[PDB]
Amino acid sequence: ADCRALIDKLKDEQLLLELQWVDLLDRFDGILADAGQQLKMLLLAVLNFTALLIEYSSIEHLTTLLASSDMQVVLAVLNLLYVFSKRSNYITRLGSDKRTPLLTRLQHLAESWGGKENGFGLAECCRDLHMMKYPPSATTLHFEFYIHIEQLDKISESPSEIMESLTKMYSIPKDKQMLLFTHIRLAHGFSNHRKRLQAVQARLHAISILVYSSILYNGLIEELVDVLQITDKQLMEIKAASLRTLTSIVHKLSSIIDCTGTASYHGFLPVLVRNCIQAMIDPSMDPYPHQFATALFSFLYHLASYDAGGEALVSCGMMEALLKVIKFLGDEQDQITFVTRAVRVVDLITNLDMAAFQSHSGLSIFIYRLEHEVDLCRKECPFVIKQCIPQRAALLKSMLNFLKKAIQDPAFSDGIRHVMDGSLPTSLKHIISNAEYYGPSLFLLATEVVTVFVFQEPSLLSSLQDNGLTDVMLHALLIKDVPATREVLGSLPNVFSALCLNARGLQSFVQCQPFERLFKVLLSPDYLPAMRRRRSSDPLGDTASNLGSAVDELMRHQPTLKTDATTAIIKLLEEICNLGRDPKYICQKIPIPLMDYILNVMKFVESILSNNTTDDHCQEFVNQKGLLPLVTILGLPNLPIDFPTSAACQAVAGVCKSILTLSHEPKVLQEGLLQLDSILSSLEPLHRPIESPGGSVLLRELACAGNVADATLSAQATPLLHALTAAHAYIMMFVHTCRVGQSEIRSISVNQWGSQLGLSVLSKLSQLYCSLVWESTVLLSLCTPNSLPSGCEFGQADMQKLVAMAARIKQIKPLLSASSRLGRALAELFGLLVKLCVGPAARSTASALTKLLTKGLSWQPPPYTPTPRFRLTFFICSVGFTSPMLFDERKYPYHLMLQKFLCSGGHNALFETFNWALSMGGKVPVSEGLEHSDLPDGTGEFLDAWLMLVEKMVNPTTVLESPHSLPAKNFPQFSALRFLVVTQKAAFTCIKNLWNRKPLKVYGGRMAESMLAILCHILRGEPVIREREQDELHTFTDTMLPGCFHLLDELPDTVYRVCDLIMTAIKRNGADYRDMILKQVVNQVWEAADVLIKAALPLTTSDTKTVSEWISQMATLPQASNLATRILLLTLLFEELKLPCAWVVESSGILNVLIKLLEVVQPCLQAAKEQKEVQTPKWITPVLLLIDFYEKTAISSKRRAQMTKYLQSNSNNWRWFDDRSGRWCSYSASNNSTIDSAWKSGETSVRFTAGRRRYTVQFTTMVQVNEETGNRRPVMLTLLILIQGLTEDMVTVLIRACVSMLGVPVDPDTLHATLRLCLRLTRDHKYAMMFAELKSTRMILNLTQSSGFNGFTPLVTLLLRHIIEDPCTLRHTMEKVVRSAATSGAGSTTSGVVSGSLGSREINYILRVLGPAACRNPDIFTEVANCCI
């Protein structure tokens, strides 16, 4: 536009700017970066114009341009920075890279001169004063950081060269020479008037910028007001700067008011304002400069915006002068702008007083001015139903905003009847009739002034109809094109809510077919920019949703309209169907924006139907047959392939869900199923294979599409791909309607899916699923670079039509995504349908879904397959699909589905897929298959998925305990017990066929872990299922250890599952079997340790390198791979079997062997530290942890033994602590016996019921928790295989080894284990002394962050405390602790009330709090507690 014309004209430049964006601002930033390093005047014009452009990269240059000798450019930079800080926070948000250099130059300009009190008042700086009435220090420099210059005149030349000469003569602080330059150029200036005024003005600007973003003082307001009083009239630019400063200072206001005098009619500011106004009105009196008058009316605006100023503007009666302005001022653009300023001030003043305005007839003055301006537009655009100059449009806008505000204000409610018998409606009639000459926000203001008036006086709507203003509004909002903007669209229904209000208005509104026109907005590209989400953060379709909710409010006020509204909605849908059906349109992301139409219409319909939740709109819409046009939108041929994943498909699904959940109506599902069945019946050619050496049907339908550049964009070019992407959209709608928690909606969904049509669809979807797994895996086999196929023309014949590799891949990828995304949506649908089915027709739905599972597991390709991998990749997703459908999250089955999966089939097929995958179709037996060299590539991945499914299928703790059980009762009753019998029997044989063979290259540790989990579940389960073949599990548990240790050699991470398997075989068998296991593990450890003890005899003869070989031989020998799992297994076994395994570890003497190995490896590790190539033997941490738990166990056994020595084994009285009374109250005899028996068994927790309340005891904490409330209460037991533990000669060697492993920083996890062991050992001060005498605190301080772990600083602090706590210091600290606990009623996690006086003080509880101290040292704790309690 004309901005562009000015740009082309400029691109004599300075002459054009004197007459008066990106590349113009870039040329400007150029010359800015040029001038600051016939030039200055170009810079000045660039600045003076830019200070208009910003008012409707330079910064770093402008800051440097402040270093100017000619203040004109400093002033222009300041005027630009004021325009910035005034309008937007552009310089406030900036970073301190240049914000501080800027603000500091501004501060050095702004800072005070001494004011009146030192003879530097601004008034005196503006009057000449002869230059001899100022302080002699004016023409003087005194800059310190020391420079002083008495007078600047004998060197008056070149102030810039003065500053540079002072740079050379003195070292001026770096980056702060600006305060010197500004003082020096000021002292040059002050000699003369222009330069003094320019310094004054620059200072005032700098103030104002520093306040819009120490400078201010008591005299500043009085100085500014005295600058304004100066009557030489040659100062108007200084007066305008002073007013703009006062304005900045408004944001002292009472002082501004006291000085300016606004509190009275006579007063300097009011009088000045009235003289400005009178000079503006009357031609004779010369007019006050435009800038000055603008500063006056901006100060009045900002002053009125604050209550103290509005009250002052009341008091001086400025409303009379401003109404004088709005009545008598002329028509020229500047006078219009002063009128709009006066209007906005009369607005601010009327937000707190009306009486002056009313007494001055201000509403009549406003209405006359609105008539005059509309009459001046009437010449340009005389049309009235039977471009506007911006300043006049802004006047009209502010004045209509005032009239709207007044109508919404009391003090006009008496009398506002006489607004619409004025001229006003005749001038609104012109704005409404010319929404293209006047802006759309002005046409909006006009219709909102009518709407607000009609809501204040609905009676006089008859008068507005009599003069036809409503009949002009109707024509302008319906028949004439609506101006396309969010606010106008948002308001039309509220306008019609007014125009209907008289019943005659309703008749006239419904006469002109309003909704056929109003709704066309949603199908029109002209209004799509209005529909697009604002801020990019409001919802998709937010504006159509608002419009719909407003039409809902409208037709809930006016129910007669409901039927026509839903008729026009249904015509919208029928037209979207038309635009999607015929070939001539093509959806753009002739191009048509169909997906945006579908999103906007659906957000509109959703809002309408779901707003009131009264099901009157849903009923009307469904009864007018709108669900056919709605549900057809999913199937539209020319919708894109990526439609089903789109927000427009989720919108259609949401409208269907809203209709379902409001109306409880099956008809949405019935119609969706009819149309889905219609689409599924179209693509049966996808089910029929090539019946020749051939690849994909989708790729034979594509390839045979001639040579069309993009076949997939045409519904005739790719009918099956577009039926795929229609079915996908329907399936995503059924997903959305299944994701429903209303049991009634679940029931009617299931009743529909259980129908004859529901099961016809579900059968066709099942065959589609298997077809899509085939097509997707073939397509990926063809996009693979001739690797998966066996050098065969399986799908090449069609790729040769399709077509150097990417040219074919990028044509298939739309097929692959259209088929893989649909498969995933089918799987989601079937999972949701299982959920709905489980929680009569559900039983047929489940039947068809388990027939799908059977079909997927028993599917066999056509006999032209080039490799079994297509079957193994079908099987992997059939298995991964059957898992979600038989088992919930939390792995509990659905017993309906397990019943039908067993009876129908799919269990025999599940296990046949394992037999097929190992035997390769009977080519090799299953027992040889796994280990066979030519086993297919994906047979480990299949077996991982199969084993992960069977692990879920076998578990009795979920299969028997599943929440989703059938009820107890003609039909065959399910038994999860017989299901587990047949499943464990079938699984065991397959595991046999995998028990000992070597593992697969990948997917061998997940195979091993799921196989071990299956064995665990079987071994735990036969004890429970024989309750309601045992010798096979017996012989297995006999021979299994060779396989367990093969797994520990091949796949160390399985050791936790091997431990759990061994523990279940033990809990099946006797201690005679526990001993055999533990002694065999210990003998394996024994030989693996003794070979490493022989691996580290010092290398005297040098036969081996003795450096790299020996250091890494300790870490890499096979034996050193064994120990890392043989010890770890023994440790897990120890943790469960606490005392048997301790007694075996003692009696074998293995602990001596491990101490000797820890000692003998230290020379090796030390030499490795001296190579600076330490690589820690991973087996070290198992040994330290085994020793740790051996001595943990022995501590504890001695304590438990001497605890048993003080208890009667019969009816050990357990007592629970009543904090309120402080009593250890007994349990019932049956509860006490239960708790005692389960403590003696060593169970961590025991459940019991008292008073029908559920209590549980936690022996880790010894707490009874009430399970309903969660209240935790303390408990006690009322008192009335000897593990020798580590001997001194072992502990001494361990301490030395742990210090040496701290010396050489072995590894983080090994330091953690060795420090844990040191922490246990050093709790005896003798060994703490040993650990501190071996200089371990230096090593600990030297340790680098490469050798650190989460617990390091706690653990090290505890170790140092163990060194510090000698018998006496420990005694004194234990005294401190005992006294503290007895004196302070400490709280606890047992609901012992904080600062209680019963519960917090019982000896039997205090000893429980002090338990950590008793463990720290029980003997000392006795001595202390005897002496201090």
Added chain:
Amino acid sequence: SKPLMPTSTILRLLAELVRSYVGIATLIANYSYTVGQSELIKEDCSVLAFVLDHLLPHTQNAEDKDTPALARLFLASLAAAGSGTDAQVALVNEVKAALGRALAMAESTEKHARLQAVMCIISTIMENNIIRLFLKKGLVNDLARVPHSLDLSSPNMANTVNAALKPLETLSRIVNQ
């Protein structure tokens, strides 16, 4: 490659061993470094003197970020631990000595960081035998003399004076109430 026990952690550790064990505070108070024991040591000086002078003051170049907060914790612990007068008297005497040393120090941001950090430690200590000692040693009078040992034009001077006023207000209140 960074050390795993930075001086911050070592300070928190010592603060804990002071707060638990009576003798540790007295042993730390009496312990003193020796000439040429470390790069930062110029002559025989106490551990409390080093913590007050080199570790406690904020400095713009990190070695450990939170050394000063934890030297403040360490000296707080060495005060709070009653330890009779063995620990508290040597703490107070050394804080007074480090104040007088920093006031005699040449005008520098090193001087203002030391001064501000000593005011912060007096304020944290102050938040009753410590107050009795601060009175007996004339610490309040050495705080009041702080501006005598400033250049009153320095851009730091107001911040160090604010810091020295902060314990003076609390102490004058606690005395004269």
